[PDB]
Each structure stands twice: as C-alpha cells, then as structure tokens.
Amino acid sequence: TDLTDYLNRHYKAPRMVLAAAGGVEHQQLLDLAQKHLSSVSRVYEEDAVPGLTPCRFTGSEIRHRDDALPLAHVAIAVEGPGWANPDNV
C-alpha cells in the first residue's frame, strides 16, 4: 500500500523526462512517446499539490569512533549554493 501510494503520488506525468541519446531521431521518439507513454497520471487525486521547502544547513560534527578499522575517512563540507546559481562553476 505504501509503494502504491508513492507511485500514485510521485510518479506523475509532468515530472518525467524521456531522454534519448545516440542513433535516434526526435520524430520517431515523439511518435513512440505518444503511442506508449501517453496518459501517465494527469491528476493529483486530492487537489493537494506537493512541493519543496528550503532545507537549512546547520553546522555540526558527527564522530563514529571505531578504532579497529585500518583507515579513517573524514569529510568536511560547507553549504553549496544550489543548482541554479552560476557561481557553482
């Protein structure tokens, strides 16, 4: 039931990219998408649009001390800007 609800809510039609790269042309791929991939969801089923909230980055430190391991892995990071910010480049 949980997987059914997840596939009904998050596998909607306007959140899918059909991407093809290689020896294909766009007209045949568009005809195939019209034939096979038409009418995925086209519905929200509760009139409740799901969205995204900005998740805050907080400074903290997690130390998983386990001294029987041969090597130690440490990752230190700060907050990145995002996808749409050009300064990532």
Added chain:
Amino acid sequence: SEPEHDHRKRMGLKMLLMMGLLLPLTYAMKRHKWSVLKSRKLAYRPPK
C-alpha cells in the same frame, strides 16, 4: 596612618567598574567555547 584613603578608593571603584565590565565578556566566551561541548550527545551501538 592612612594618607592613602582617597586614592585607594579611587582605584577601588575603577577596579570594580573594570571588573564588572570585563567579567561577563570572559564568561560569555567560556560559555561559547564550552557550549560547543555541552551540546554533545553520545550513542553506543554494539553489534549484539
């Protein structure tokens, strides 16, 4: 016996005002540099 009384009390209230100014600064610095430690929660996950 005390020709020093007025100047001693002058340095007394100067010391009192300076100490009351500079003690909460070091107190807040100590509270910051130990509140990095007092927020630490520890967990034990044995393999059972």
